[PDB]
Every structure is written in structure tokens, then in C-alpha cells.
């Protein structure tokens, strides 16, 4: 998943 402000997958 995408974690707003923490991690954004590519």
C-alpha cells in the first residue's frame, strides 16, 4: 500500500 507521508511505491 501507499503510506501517506512515509512511503510511496513505484
Amino acid at each position, epitope marked *: 500500500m501507499s503510506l501517506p507521508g512515509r*512511503w510511496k511505491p513505484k
Partner: single-chain antibody, 239 residues
Framework: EVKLVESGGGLVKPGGSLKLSCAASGFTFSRFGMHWVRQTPEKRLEWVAYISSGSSTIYYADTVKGRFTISRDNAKNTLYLQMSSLRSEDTAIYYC??????????????????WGQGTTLTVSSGGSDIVLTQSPASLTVSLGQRATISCRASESVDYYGKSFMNWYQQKPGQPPKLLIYAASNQGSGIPARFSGSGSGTDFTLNIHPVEEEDAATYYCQQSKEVPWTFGAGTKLEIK
């Protein structure tokens, strides 16, 4: 260079209202998420609020929800924090921290990379958070030797092969500065004598060889789950 200037603090009676501002310059403000982080007079770091670059996602700490409001004006490059129903517990120096994205092979890693000098607020007279137990409370090393600061998280800060553990250094009067991100990766212009390690729940920061300027207070931080949480801090003194 990137700069952040907080303002708007001062003395306020309990239950009062107040608004902080931060003027951002030196970077494309509209493309970065922004944080409010406060430091109590006890040198304890507490994450307050977060807003995305486009204002699509907003997080508040559980102790400030409802009473606080974070907002941003991307046209004016300004970040705001509306406070109401203020309590004595809100007494702290309030920093604005930029959420800087670091690109990896599998995605982008976001960390609080830039901090302002902060503005001071003074207020007159469940537990599902990831708790970071830092060790030790303080430590005194001679010049040139090794300094080791440990952290044990209440649960795993690992997420799909990545450890969301960060380390910050703060000298008196200054804001925290990013040392290590993602448990073991070195921040912007961090000398090689700072080395992060660990995985899951056990993490360590090593300073070798310690220099005189390394005298500061060090905090661990997990960025896997909201709220962002900090260790209690370790004050490093040299000889």
C-alpha cells in the same frame, strides 16, 4: 538553500487560542508535505500534525486532535497551525519540518529532512502507538572513541523489506538534523563516522570516531505508522 521560519508563539492562558505561521523559501513549497513537531522543555520531541503537498491527507496527534488545525497556502509558501483550547501540556517550541522524499528502487522514502528554528509557545498555570525505547539516557565518551545509542520499538517498524527507522541529532538552540534514514542509509552530507544498523524492533546508532562537535542530543524516530514517534533522547557529551 531551503529555509523555514516559524513565528506566532508567546504566552497564552489555558483554554486560549493562537495561530502559528511558517514562511518557506528556497524550495518548491507546493511539492512537499510539511510537519509541525514540538519539543517540550524536557527535550522530548512530539509530532503534532502533517499535511500533504496537495492537502489531500492530514494527520494529527491524538493529544491535539480537534483543538488543532493544520493548513497551508501554497501560493504564499506558508504553513499554519491553528490552536484552541490550549493546555499547559502544549507548552513547547514548535518546529516546522519538511517531508523530503528519497527515491529508492521500489519507491520513494519520506523523511523530515529540513527544520526551522522554531517558535516558542508558553501556556500559563488507545495506546496503539509504536513506542521507541531508547538507550541510554546519556553517555560520556573521550575524544576519538565509540558511542553507541540503541532503540527497541514496541513492534516491528519493518515494511516489506524496509526498516522505517530514522536518527536525528540536535545541538542546543538548533533544530533536529537528519542523520540516518531507513535504519542504515546516511542523510545529506552526514560524515561516515555516523553509522545506522538494525532491523525489525532492534536498532543501533554508532558514532566512530566521536568528534568534539558530536556533542549533542540524539533521537530515534519511526516513520512506518502514524503517529510518528520519537525516542526519549540521549545526550552525548565528549570527555
Amino acid at each position: 538553500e531551503v529555509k523555514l521560519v516559524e513565528s506566532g508563539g508567546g504566552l497564552v492562558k489555558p483554554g486560549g487560542s493562537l495561530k502559528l505561521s511558517c514562511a518557506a523559501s528556497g524550495f518548491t513549497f507546493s511539492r512537499f508535505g510539511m510537519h509541525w513537531v514540538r519539543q517540550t522543555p524536557e527535550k522530548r520531541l512530539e509530532w503534532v500534525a502533517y499535511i500533504s503537498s496537495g492537502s489531500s491527507t492530514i494527520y494529527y496527534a491524538d493529544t491535539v486532535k480537534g483543538r488543532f488545525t493544520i493548513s497551508r497556502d501554497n501560493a504564499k509558501n506558508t504553513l499554519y497551525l491553528q490552536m484552541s483550547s490550549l493546555r499547559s501540556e502544549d507548552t513547547a517550541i514548535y518546529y516546522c519540518a519538511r517531508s523530503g522524499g528519497i527515491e529508492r528502487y521500489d519507491g520513494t522514502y519520506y523523511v523530515m529532512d529540513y527544520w526551522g528554528q522554531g517558535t516558542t509557545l508558553t501556556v500559563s498555570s488507545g495506546g496503539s502507538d509504536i513506542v521507541l525505547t531508547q538507550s541510554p539516557a546519556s553517555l560520556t565518551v573521550s575524544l576519538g572513541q565509540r558511542a553507541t545509542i540503541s532503540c527497541r520499538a514496541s513492534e516491528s517498524v519493518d515494511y516489506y523489506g524496509k526498516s522505517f527507522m530514522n536518527w536525528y541529532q540536535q545541538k542546543p538552540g538548533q533544530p533536529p538534523k537528519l542523520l540516518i534514514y531507513a535504519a542504515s542509509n546516511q542523510g545529506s552530507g552526514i560524515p561516515a563516522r555516523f553509522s545506522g544498523s538494525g532491523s525489525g524492533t532492534d536498532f543501533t546508532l554508532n558514532i566512530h570516531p566521536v568528534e568534539e562537535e558530536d556533542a549533542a542530543t540524539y533521537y530515534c524516530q519511526q516513520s512506518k505508522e502514524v503517529p510518528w514517534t520519537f525516542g526519549a533522547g540521549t545526550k552525548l557529551e565528549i570527555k
